[PDB]
Amino acid sequence: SFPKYEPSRLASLPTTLDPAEYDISSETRKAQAERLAIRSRLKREYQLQYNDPSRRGVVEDPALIRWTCARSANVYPNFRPNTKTSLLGALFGIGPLIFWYYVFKTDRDRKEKLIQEGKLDRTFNISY
């Protein structure tokens, strides 16, 4: 009794009407079992290195370090300049720059022409 709730890029599809959580196969429950095994082992080593009274520094989280090295400086290897990369580069760099260049030449030429007329409203226009 509903228009069946299309998702979007933002309106996320909640876990009720998936409907992929209905046709449960073997590898689905095998995947959930191994996924709980992964979360179990990670919380086990976390709680081991979290309740130590000899522990002084931080718990030294490797995955945050890994993601930092990913987002920061492992961008450039790898990279090959492809059609997509180069075209989107020359669009996002030179495009708005040449756009603002045209609009500033437009306003400056209008202003120079209007003050070369002699009738600019410089009734008092001191602080230039």
Partner: peptide
């Protein structure tokens, strides 16, 4: 525990004496 723990509920210290494990925080 097994080599793969496969759950997260930790067993109490039913063995002999003191407090059940990992209780500080």
């Amino acid at each position: 525990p097994v080599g793969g723990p496969r759950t997260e509920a930790l067993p109490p210290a039913r063995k002999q004496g003191d407090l059940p494990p990992l209780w500080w925080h």
